[PDB]
Amino acid sequence: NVEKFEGAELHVHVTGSISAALVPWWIHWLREFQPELVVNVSVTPAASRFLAVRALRHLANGKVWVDSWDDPDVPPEVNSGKSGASECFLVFPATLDTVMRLAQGRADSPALMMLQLTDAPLVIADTFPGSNEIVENNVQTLKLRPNVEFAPRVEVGFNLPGALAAANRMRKEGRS
Amino acid sequence: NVEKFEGAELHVHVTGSISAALVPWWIHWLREFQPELVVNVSVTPAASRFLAVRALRHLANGKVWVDSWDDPDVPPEVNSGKSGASECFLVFPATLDTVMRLAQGRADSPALMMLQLTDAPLVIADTFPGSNEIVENNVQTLKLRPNVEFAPRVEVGFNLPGALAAANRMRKEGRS
Amino acid sequence: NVEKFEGAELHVHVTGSISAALVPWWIHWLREFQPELVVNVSVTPAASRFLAVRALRHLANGKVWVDSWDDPDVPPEVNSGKSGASECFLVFPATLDTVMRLAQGRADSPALMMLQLTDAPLVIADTFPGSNEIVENNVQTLKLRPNVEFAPRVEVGFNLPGALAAANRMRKEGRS
Amino acid sequence: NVEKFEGAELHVHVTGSISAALVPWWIHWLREFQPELVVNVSVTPAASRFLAVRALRHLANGKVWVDSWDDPDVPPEVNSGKSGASECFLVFPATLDTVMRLAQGRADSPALMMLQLTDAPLVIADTFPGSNEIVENNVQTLKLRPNVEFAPRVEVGFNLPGALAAANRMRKEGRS
Amino acid sequence: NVEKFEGAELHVHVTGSISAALVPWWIHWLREFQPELVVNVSVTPAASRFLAVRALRHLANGKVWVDSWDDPDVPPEVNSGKSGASECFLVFPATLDTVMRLAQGRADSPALMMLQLTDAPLVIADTFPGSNEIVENNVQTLKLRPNVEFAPRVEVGFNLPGALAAANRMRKEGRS
Amino acid sequence: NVEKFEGAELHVHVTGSISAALVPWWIHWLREFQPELVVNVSVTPAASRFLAVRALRHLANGKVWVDSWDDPDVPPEVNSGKSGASECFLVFPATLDTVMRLAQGRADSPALMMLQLTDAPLVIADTFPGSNEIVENNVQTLKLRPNVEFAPRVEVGFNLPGALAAANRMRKEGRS
Ligand SMILES: Cc1cc2nc3c(=O)[nH]c(=O)nc-3n(C[C@H](O)[C@H](O)[C@H](O)COP(=O)(O)OP(=O)(O)OC[C@H]3O[C@@H](n4cnc5c(N)ncnc54)[C@H](O)[C@@H]3O)c2cc1C
Ligand SMILES: Cc1cc2nc3c(=O)[nH]c(=O)nc-3n(C[C@H](O)[C@H](O)[C@H](O)COP(=O)(O)OP(=O)(O)OC[C@H]3O[C@@H](n4cnc5c(N)ncnc54)[C@H](O)[C@@H]3O)c2cc1C
Ligand SMILES: Cc1cc2nc3c(=O)[nH]c(=O)nc-3n(C[C@H](O)[C@H](O)[C@H](O)COP(=O)(O)OP(=O)(O)OC[C@H]3O[C@@H](n4cnc5c(N)ncnc54)[C@H](O)[C@@H]3O)c2cc1C
Ligand SMILES: Cc1cc2nc3c(=O)[nH]c(=O)nc-3n(C[C@H](O)[C@H](O)[C@H](O)COP(=O)(O)OP(=O)(O)OC[C@H]3O[C@@H](n4cnc5c(N)ncnc54)[C@H](O)[C@@H]3O)c2cc1C
Ligand SMILES: Cc1cc2nc3c(=O)[nH]c(=O)nc-3n(C[C@H](O)[C@H](O)[C@H](O)COP(=O)(O)OP(=O)(O)OC[C@H]3O[C@@H](n4cnc5c(N)ncnc54)[C@H](O)[C@@H]3O)c2cc1C
Ligand SMILES: Cc1cc2nc3c(=O)[nH]c(=O)nc-3n(C[C@H](O)[C@H](O)[C@H](O)COP(=O)(O)OP(=O)(O)OC[C@H]3O[C@@H](n4cnc5c(N)ncnc54)[C@H](O)[C@@H]3O)c2cc1C
C-alpha cells in the first residue's frame, strides 16, 4: 500500500527520539524508491545525538541543516515558512516536546519558525513515550491549523509511507 | 503536626530558586526523621547554581542526577514516568517557570518528561516571586491532572512536612 | 506627531530580529530628543548577534544588561517586576517567540520574569515574519493583562514614537 | 531466505562507510527478529562520523564501545580475541582499509587485536568503492585464516541476513 | 537556650565538610533571628564543592568571598586580621585540616592570614571524622592563643547557637 | 539636499568609533533610498565591538567582510585597490587612527591595502575626538592623493548624504 509523493521536493524535520537513529535508512529508502524527489532535511540538536548530520548530507540530495539559529547552513526562507521548493513537511520522528512547541506557536528554532509559517501540508510522525490530559489538549489545539495532520498509526506514528500518502492527499485537496 | 511519608521511596525535583540552597538541610532532616525512606533527587541546571549536586549525592540515599538530557546519571525510566520505585514526586522548591512548563505539557528536560508521564501523587512546593492573570490560568490548567496538588501554605508553598502529608493523603485515595 | 515620554525613566527590552541592529540609532535619537530621560536596556542573547551590548552601554544612560540568569549585571529587582525606576517597558523590537513566551507566563529569562511581574505600561513593538491561528490566540491571551498593548502600526509595530505615545497614555489612565 | 543466528551472542564491528549510517536500523531489525540474542557492538572513530554510538547503546543489548585503545568501555578480553561470549564476529560494514589492516596482521585498534586473536567465525560485509591487483592480493591473504569469510553478495557484501547464515554455517562446521 | 550575638557584625569561615551544605540554612536562620546583624562569609575551595557561594551572596548581608589569594572579592583588611567590622570569627564548619593549619601558624589562604592576625573571639565549630595523638597535640597548641575556643558540643561542634553564646562571652570578657 | 550616488556599486569601510553602532541604520536607509545600488562593507575588529557584522550581511546586498588578513571572506581584489565593482569608497565612520594609518601609507589590514591602491573617489567621514599639530600635518599629507576628500561637516564629518554628493562630484570630475 506504499505510494510515491506526487510533488517535486519535500522537507524532513528530524527530532530527538531514538527513532532518529533509523531515519538515515528511511531517507536512503525514499531516495531509491523515488530518485527524482529532492529531499531537504533539518535535524534538532537532540536528534543529532542519535544520528550523524554528515551521513544525511550524503544520503539526502537537498539542503541539510541543524535546527539552530547559529547554524550557517540555515536557509533564509525559513522566515517565510519555506524550505527550498518543499511542497510538504514531515516531522519524522516528532517528539512530545516538538509537538507541544508547535501547538504553542513557538519559533525558538528556525525549523519551528518555518513550521509556524508554512501553509503546505505538515505531517507529524509522533513518537510520544506517553500522554496526559494537558498534552492531549495541546494536540487538539493543532486542529486550528488546516494544513497539520498526524500520520497514520502502525499506537505510534513513525510511518513514512503513511506520511507520504497523507501528504499527497492534503496536496491535491489544496488545488481542487 | 509533622507525619512520616507512608511509602518506601520518593523523588525530590529541585528547581532554581534561592530556596534550593536550603534543600540539603531538608534532605538531611528527612533522612534522620525517616531512615528507611529511599530519597531520589533531580536538580535543574538553574538550581545547581544555588546548591551543590555533590552534597546531595552524600545526603540522599537514592539516585541523584542533573535534570539534563546529556547527563549520564539520568535513569532510563524517566521515559515511563518513574524514578526508581518512587511513590510520590515533590517539586521542592518549584519556580514559576517549572510550573508553567508543567502546565504546558513540556518535556524539554528528563524530569519534566518524568513529571508529565507519572500517575503518582505530584506535589508542588511553589516559590513564585509574584503572579498575573496568565500565570493563574496556567496554574488552573494543572487541575486537568488528578495526581497534581500544590503543597499547603506557610503565601509560599516551601513546605516539605505539608508536602509529605499531602502525598500520603493522595497515595491512600489512590488505593481505596 | 512625535511626543515626549512624560515619565523620568523607562526600560527597553531588545529581542532577536534584524531590527535590533537599528535600535542603537533609536536609543541615540531618544537620548538627544529627551536628555533628562533615564533609559535602561536589556538585550536577549539572540539580539546580541545583531547589535553590540557595549555600544548600548555608551548610548544609554541607565543600566544595560544581557537577558540571562548568569549575567552579573542583571539587577535584583527583576524579581519584583522592576528595572530601576522605569515607569514603562518597551519590547523594541519584539520577536514572535518573545511574545509567545510572554503570552504563556514564561519566566525563563530575567527580562521575562520582569515583564510577567510588572504592573507598569508594557508596549510591544512586534516584528513578526508572519502568523497563524495558534499565534493569534496567544496574542489574544495578552488582553488578560490590563497593562499590555501592541504599539501603533507603521503591518509591523517597530515604532518607538508610537510606543512612547501609547506609554504616556497608559501611564495617565493609571493615575486618574 | 532469512534465518536466525544459532548462537547466544555475537559481535558487530562497524567501520567508516556511509553504510554505517544504516547499521542502527539493521541492529534494531536483528533485536526484534531475535530478542534472545545478545548483540555487542564496536564502532571505529571513522564510523562514529556516520552514526551515533549513543543510539547503539540504546538499540543493542550487549556492550557497546568505540574502537580506540583510550576508550574506557573497551573490554579487557579483546586481548584474548573475545567480546563477552560472542560466538561470531561480523564486520558490518567493512571498509577497504579495515580489510587491508586485517590482512596485514595489524592490532592498532582493540577491535583489530580482537579480530586477529579470535578463532570464532569472522564474516566480512565489505563495502569497497573499488579495487586493484594489490588489494585483491591482500584479500587472498585472508584465506590463510580458516575462520574468515566474506558475506554473500547482494557486487557489494552489505548483507546481514547472508552474514548470519554464513556464520551459523561456519559455527556448525567447527563442532562436527 | 538560644541567645543573640551582642555585636553588630561577625564573620563566618566555611570549610570543606559535608556540613557546609547545611550552612546556607543556618545563615538564613541567623539573618531572620537577628536582622540587624551584618554577616560576612568566606568559603574555602573545598567547601565550594558542597555549597554555592552565589546562594550566600543572596542570604548574607555582608561581604562574601572565596578563601583564595587570587579571588578579587578578598578584602584587603584580611592582612590586618579583620573582616569589615566583624567582632567575632566562627569557623563553621571546621575541618581537621583547617584546624591543623591554624594550630601551625599557616597563612596559605587569606582567611587563614585573617584568623592568624585577629585578636577578636575565634570560635571553632569542628567537624572531625576522628583523631590521633598528633592531632590532639596540635589542638592543645591553640590554647597559646587567648582568643580561640572550640564551640560547645552537640561529640561534634557543628553548633552555631552555642558558638554565638561562646562568642558573646569572650567579647564581654575582653571589655571588663 | 539629499541626492543619489550616480554609480552602480560602492564600498563602506566602518571603523571603531561609537558611531559605528549607527551605521546599520544608515546602510538600511541607503538600501531603501536606492534599491539598485550594490553596497559592499568592510568592518575593522574595533568597529566589530560596536556593531554586529552578521546584521550587515543581512542589511547590505554586496560582500561583507572583517578587515583582517586572516578573514576568509576578504576578496582577493583588495590587492589591486578594488572591492567588487565599487566606484567609490566611504570611510564611515573614520577614526583618528584609521586616518593616520592612511596618511602614512600603511597596508596592515586588507581594507587599508585597498584604500592605498584605489584611484576611485575616497571620502572620509571623520569622527575624531580631538586634534593636535602632528595630526593636522598627517591630514594635510592626504592632499598628495587627488582622489581623497573629507566629507562635508554637520565640526564632525559623520555625514553619509554629504559623502554621497562629494562622491558623485569626484566621479564626474574623473570622466570629463
Ligand atoms: C534515549 C532517549 C529516547 C527518547 N525518546 C523520546 C521519544 O521517543 N519521544 C519523545 O517525545 N522524547 C523522547 N526523548 C526525549 C527528547 O529527546 C527530549 O524531549 C528532547 O528535548 C527533544 O528535543 P527536540 O529534538 O524535540 O528539539 P530540540 O531543538 O533538541 O529542543 C531542545 C530544547 O532547547 C531549546 N533551545 C532552543 N535554542 C537552544 C539553544 N541555543 N541551546 C539550548 N537549548 C535551546 C528548545 O526550544 C527546546 O526546548 C528521548 C530521550 C532519550 C535520551
Ligand atoms: C537569586 C535568584 C532567585 C530566584 N528566585 C526565584 C524564585 O523564588 N521563584 C522563581 O520562580 N524563580 C526564581 N528565580 C528565577 C529562576 O532561577 C529562573 O526562572 C530559572 O529559569 C528557573 O529554571 P528552573 O530551575 O525552573 O529550570 P531549568 O532547567 O534551569 O530551566 C532553564 C530553561 O532552559 C531550557 N533548557 C532546556 N534544555 C536546555 C539546555 N540544554 N541549555 C539551556 N537551556 C535549556 C529549559 O526548558 C528552561 O526553559 C530566581 C533567580 C535568581 C537569580
Ligand atoms: C536574520 C534573522 C532575522 C530574524 N527576524 C526575526 C523577526 O523579524 N521576527 C521574529 O519574530 N523572529 C525573527 N528571527 C528569529 C529569532 O531570532 C528567533 O526566534 C530567536 O529565538 C528569538 O529569540 P529572542 O531574542 O526572542 O529571545 P532569546 O532569549 O534569544 O530566546 C532564546 C531561547 O532560548 C531559551 N533559553 C533560555 N535560557 C537559555 C540558555 N541559558 N541557553 C540557551 N537558550 C536559553 C529561551 O527561553 C528562548 O526560548 C530572525 C532570525 C534571523 C537569523
Ligand atoms: C562519505 C564517505 C564514504 C566512504 N565510503 C567508504 C566505503 O564505502 N568503503 C570504504 O572502504 N571506505 C569508505 N570511505 C573511506 C573510509 O572512511 C576511510 O578509509 C577510513 O579511514 C576508514 O576507517 P575505518 O572505519 O576502517 O577505521 P578507523 O579506526 O577509523 O581507521 C583510522 C586510521 O587511523 C589509525 N589510527 C589508529 N589509532 C589512531 C588514533 N589514536 N588516532 C588517529 N588515527 C588512529 C588506524 O590504524 C587507521 O589507519 C568513505 C569516506 C567518506 C568520507
Ligand atoms: C564527602 C566528604 C566529606 C568530608 N567531611 C569532612 C569532615 O567532616 N571533616 C573534615 O575534617 N574533613 C572532611 N573532609 C575532607 C576535607 O574536605 C579535606 O580535608 C579538605 O582538604 C578540607 O579543606 P578546607 O576546606 O579545610 O580548606 P582548603 O582551602 O580547601 O584546603 C585545600 C588545601 O590546598 C592548599 N592550597 C592553598 N592554596 C591552594 C591553591 N591555590 N590550589 C590548591 N591548593 C591550595 C591549602 O593550604 C590546603 O592545604 C571531607 C571530604 C569529603 C569528600
Ligand atoms: C567607546 C569608544 C569610543 C571611541 N570613539 C572614537 C572616535 O569617535 N574616534 C576615534 O578616532 N577613536 C575612537 N575610539 C578609539 C578607537 O576605537 C581606537 O583608536 C581603535 O584603535 C580604532 O581602530 P580602527 O577601527 O580604526 O582600526 P583597527 O583595525 O581596529 O586597528 C587596530 C590596530 O591594530 C593593528 N592590527 C593590525 N593587525 C592586527 C592584528 N592581527 N591584531 C591586532 N592588532 C592588529 C592595526 O594596524 C591598528 O593599529 C573610541 C574608543 C572607544 C572605546
PDB file of C-alpha atoms in Angstrom, chain F residues 11 13 42-45 65-83 89 101 106-118:
ATOM      1  CA  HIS F  11      32.132  50.221  -0.605  1.00  0.00           C
ATOM      2  CA  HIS F  13      34.652  50.877   5.401  1.00  0.00           C
ATOM      3  CA  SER F  42      34.317  46.115   5.427  1.00  0.00           C
ATOM      4  CA  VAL F  43      34.405  46.324   9.243  1.00  0.00           C
ATOM      5  CA  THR F  44      37.523  46.712  11.451  1.00  0.00           C
ATOM      6  CA  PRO F  45      37.931  44.481  14.501  1.00  0.00           C
ATOM      7  CA  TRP F  65      33.979  41.170   5.486  1.00  0.00           C
ATOM      8  CA  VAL F  66      36.040  41.830   8.607  1.00  0.00           C
ATOM      9  CA  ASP F  67      39.126  43.951   7.817  1.00  0.00           C
ATOM     10  CA  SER F  68      41.740  41.263   8.751  1.00  0.00           C
ATOM     11  CA  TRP F  69      44.280  39.385   6.630  1.00  0.00           C
ATOM     12  CA  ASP F  70      43.050  36.075   8.264  1.00  0.00           C
ATOM     13  CA  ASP F  71      39.319  36.569   7.477  1.00  0.00           C
ATOM     14  CA  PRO F  72      38.396  34.101   4.703  1.00  0.00           C
ATOM     15  CA  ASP F  73      35.709  36.480   3.259  1.00  0.00           C
ATOM     16  CA  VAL F  74      38.369  39.092   2.310  1.00  0.00           C
ATOM     17  CA  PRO F  75      38.128  39.359  -1.510  1.00  0.00           C
ATOM     18  CA  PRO F  76      41.405  38.948  -3.432  1.00  0.00           C
ATOM     19  CA  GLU F  77      40.962  42.241  -5.428  1.00  0.00           C
ATOM     20  CA  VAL F  78      41.830  44.304  -2.283  1.00  0.00           C
ATOM     21  CA  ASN F  79      45.472  43.750  -3.546  1.00  0.00           C
ATOM     22  CA  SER F  80      44.508  45.794  -6.736  1.00  0.00           C
ATOM     23  CA  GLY F  81      42.648  48.542  -4.849  1.00  0.00           C
ATOM     24  CA  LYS F  82      39.171  47.190  -5.642  1.00  0.00           C
ATOM     25  CA  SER F  83      36.032  45.977  -3.803  1.00  0.00           C
ATOM     26  CA  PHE F  89      34.950  54.221  -1.017  1.00  0.00           C
ATOM     27  CA  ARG F 101      47.351  54.901   9.011  1.00  0.00           C
ATOM     28  CA  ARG F 106      50.083  51.685   5.932  1.00  0.00           C
ATOM     29  CA  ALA F 107      48.726  48.403   4.466  1.00  0.00           C
ATOM     30  CA  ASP F 108      48.490  46.437   7.805  1.00  0.00           C
ATOM     31  CA  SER F 109      44.836  45.474   7.024  1.00  0.00           C
ATOM     32  CA  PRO F 110      43.347  44.433   3.680  1.00  0.00           C
ATOM     33  CA  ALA F 111      40.955  47.485   3.678  1.00  0.00           C
ATOM     34  CA  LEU F 112      43.996  49.749   4.087  1.00  0.00           C
ATOM     35  CA  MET F 113      45.861  47.973   1.244  1.00  0.00           C
ATOM     36  CA  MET F 114      42.647  48.533  -0.781  1.00  0.00           C
ATOM     37  CA  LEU F 115      42.369  52.246   0.171  1.00  0.00           C
ATOM     38  CA  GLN F 116      46.129  52.775  -0.595  1.00  0.00           C
ATOM     39  CA  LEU F 117      45.752  51.248  -4.116  1.00  0.00           C
ATOM     40  CA  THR F 118      42.375  52.631  -5.255  1.00  0.00           C
TER      41      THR F 118
END
